[PDB]
């Protein structure tokens, strides 16, 4: 098999910056190769194809490269929507392999998260379970940690993480923390918060709300 | 528009069988050799198997070499995965691609997901995330869905059916302790026109025959209820 490795794996830039990512073939495969742009959860896109041709609609910025063993993608201006992981893919010789692909975040300024806290809801606790979301809105970077507090009681090892990827407008992140108690237990305390502390914010934010106030 | 739509995926048990089918409109269809792209979760794209123009001359990854079988109905403009012996490497979003001789792969699907378990199919619970009294960011307001205790991906949830696409936030799938998975989807709006608007999640979950909408909407907080 024709195996193809890209270099990096991953990388970040910022908008306007040049970005070259590099494909190699364990074979010489000609000038035939294909490089295709995914956005998380979404369908790939060819952007390249027999390495150096932009497929119709393209941007320009995307300029392919190389020959035989050696290829390369070249982004010139990134773009916030450029956040994405592309791949290249052989098209000289069966079986078609693609490489590992290269995943391409988009560096920004420090952006402090908007917290929003959610109380379960009235129908959630008739379940014997409740959830109380903390809702971490449009920051960057992606590092952040969520502190739950029942009662001022630190709370650990009850709480589940989501972080979504990075929007291709404003080149932000958004993170959900789930915290999961029995009904009872939930019932029982008053006082629940979410100390959300991140790189933007000088002392950390908290939000809050009473279990039977509102 | 040049489409390819993705079906028959869902919930297997390790051993069984199901069929991908995939419909293109939009192109010529005779002249395209199709192509199925899986990706499994966390994991990079991976070619499987793909099928010649004229049918007939097919090829496979040597991973599911003997057990997937490529076809194509040049008649109804399908194509064809019959998946046999599946395993649980098999578990990944299955995408159909027409390519143009050497030319690469220029026309996608959307995918189609195949989960790979001997876990039986469950259906969510949708529950809403009521924006607060006060929410004063500024004039915007944050308000959600909760879709909790499912099985297996994925899950589609719409705000107001596809009408309210800005601000949206549908978070990645958490695999809880009790093997089923959960996610919120969240969106902000202006706090202002919280009475005046109507907000709706609409859920589906396809391995189930699931489908709710749930209206949200903000409460007295005075005295709760």
């Known amino acids: 098999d024709i195996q193809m490795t890209q270099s990096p794996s991953s990388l970040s830039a910022s908008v306007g910056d040049r970005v070259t990512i590099t494909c190699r073939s364990s074979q010489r495969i000609m000038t035939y190769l294909n490089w295709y742009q995914q956005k998380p959860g979404k369908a790939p896109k060819l952007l390249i194809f027999v390495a150096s041709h932009s497929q119709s609609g393209v941007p320009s910025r995307f300029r392919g490269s190389g020959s035989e063993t050696d290829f390369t993608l070249t982004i010139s201006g990134l773009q916030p929507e450029d956040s994405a992981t592309y791949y290249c893919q052989q098209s000289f010789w069966t079986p078609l392999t693609f490489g590992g692909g290269t995943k391409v975040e988009i560096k920004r300024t420090v952006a402090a998260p908007s917290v929003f806290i959610f109380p379960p809801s009235d129908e959630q606790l008739k379940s014997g379970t409740a959830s109380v979301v903390c809702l971490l809105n449009n920051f960057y970077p992606r590092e952040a940690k969520v502190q739950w507090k029942v009662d001022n009681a630190l709370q650990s090892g009850n709480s589940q993480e989501s972080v979504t990827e990075q929007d291709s407008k404003d080149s932000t992140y958004s993170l959900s923390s789930t915290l999961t108690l029995s009904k009872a237990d939930y019932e029982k305390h008053k006082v629940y918060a979410c100390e959300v502390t991140h790189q933007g914010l000088s002392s950390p934010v908290t939000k809050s709300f009473n279990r039977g106030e509102c | 528009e040049v489409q390819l739509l993705e079906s028959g995926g869902g919930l297997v048990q390790p051993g069984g069988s199901l069929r991908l089918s995939c419909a293109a409109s939009g192109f010529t269809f005779s002249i395209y050799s199709m192509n199925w792209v899986r990706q499994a979760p966390g994991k990079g794209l991976e070619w499987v198997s793909s099928?010649?123009?004229?049918?007939?001359?097919?090829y496979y990854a040597d991973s599911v070499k003997g057990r997937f079988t490529i076809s194509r109905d040049n008649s109804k403009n399908t194509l064809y995965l019959q998946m046999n012996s599946l395993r649980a490497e098999d578990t990944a979003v299955y995408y159909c691609?027409?390519?143009?001789?050497?030319?690469?792969?220029?026309?996608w699907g959307q995918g189609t997901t195949v989960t790979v378990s001997s876990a039986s199919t469950k259906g969510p619970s949708v529950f809403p995330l009521a924006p607060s009294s006060k929410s004063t960011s500024g004039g915007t307001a944050a308000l959600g869905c909760l879709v909790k205790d499912y099985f297996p991906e994925p899950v589609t949830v719409s705000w107001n059916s596809g009408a309210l696409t800005s601000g949206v936030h549908t978070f990645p799938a958490v695999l809880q302790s009790s093997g089923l998975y959960s996610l919120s989807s969240v969106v902000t709006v202006p706090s202002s026109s919280l009475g005046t608007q109507t907000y709706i999640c609409n859920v589906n979950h396809k391995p189930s025959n699931t489908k709710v909408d749930k209206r949200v909407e903000p409460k007295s907080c005075d005295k709760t209820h």
């Open positions: 691609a027409g390519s143009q001789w050497l030319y690469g792969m220029d026309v």
């Open positions: 099928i010649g123009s004229s049918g007939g001359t097919t």
